[PDB]
Amino acid sequence: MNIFEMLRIDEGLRLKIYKDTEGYYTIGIGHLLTKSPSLNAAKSELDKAIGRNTNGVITKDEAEKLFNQDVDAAVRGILRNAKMKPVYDSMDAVRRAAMINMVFQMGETGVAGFTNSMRMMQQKRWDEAAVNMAKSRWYNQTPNRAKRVITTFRTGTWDAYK
Ligand SMILES: [Cl-]
Ligand SMILES: [Cl-]
């Protein structure tokens, strides 16, 4: 188990434009194309990303290429963030994967309202942070996923994924 398998379980794999759980256009392994209601807009973003006239459809290889880039950008976003970097550095590898999953799903922006949980996490108060994290829109909207991620932080093991 690793970050790639972990997120691939959480996001699934789709080769045609689809609406995520927030109603946004997405494709591949959770790659958000656009927050706009416009599908054409979404199709243009897709072509731009892939480098061709996709017609709203990509192959498995293109999906995987997007996913590599996105996981790479999530990490780097953490590291560049002044408030995140230190939490991230204080953690073991498993818990770091949990942090990358959340950044992947919600952006540096969404993860940033998790300040309190993060400070507990820094202090290694796992059970408490798990509880606080559950008090969120995030847990409310995608509970099964949220649960998997929270156990992961809580335990520091891959159990919720095995
Ligand atoms: Cl892109
Ligand atoms: Cl869910």
Swiss-Prot record:
Substrate binds at L32, F104, S117, N132. The active site is at E11 (proton donor/acceptor), D20 (proton donor/acceptor). Induction: Expressed late in the viral replication. It is found in: Host cytoplasm. Changing D20 to A/N/S/T: Complete loss of enzymatic activity. InterPro entries: Endolysin_T4_type, Glyco_hydro_24, Lysozyme-like_dom_sf, Lysozyme_dom_sf, Phage_lysozyme-like, T4-type_lysozyme. It holds the Pfam family Phage_lysozyme. One of its GO terms (biological process) is defense response to bacterium. Gene3D superfamilies: 1.10.530.40. Changing G30A: Almost complete loss of enzymatic activity. Belongs to the glycosyl hydrolase 24 family. The keyword Hydrolase applies. Optimum pH is 7.3. Its EC number is 3.2.1.17. Changing E11N: Loss of 84% of enzymatic activity. It is an enzyme of class 3 (hydrolase). Keywords: Antimicrobial, Bacteriolytic enzyme, Cytolysis, Glycosidase, Host cell lysis by virus, Host cytoplasm, Hydrolase, Viral release from host cell. One of its GO terms (molecular function) is lysozyme activity. This is Endolysin. Its main location: host cell. GO terms for cellular component: host cell cytoplasm. Endolysin with lysozyme activity that degrades host peptidoglycans and participates with the holin and spanin proteins in the sequential events which lead to the programmed host cell lysis releasing the mature viral particles. Once the holin has permeabilized the host cell membrane, the endolysin can reach the periplasm and break down the peptidoglycan layer. It comes from the Viruses. It catalyses: Hydrolysis of (1->4)-beta-linkages between N-acetylmuramic acid and N-acetyl-D-glucosamine residues in a peptidoglycan and between N-acetyl-D-glucosamine residues in chitodextrins. Changing D20 to E/Q: Loss of 99% of enzymatic activity.
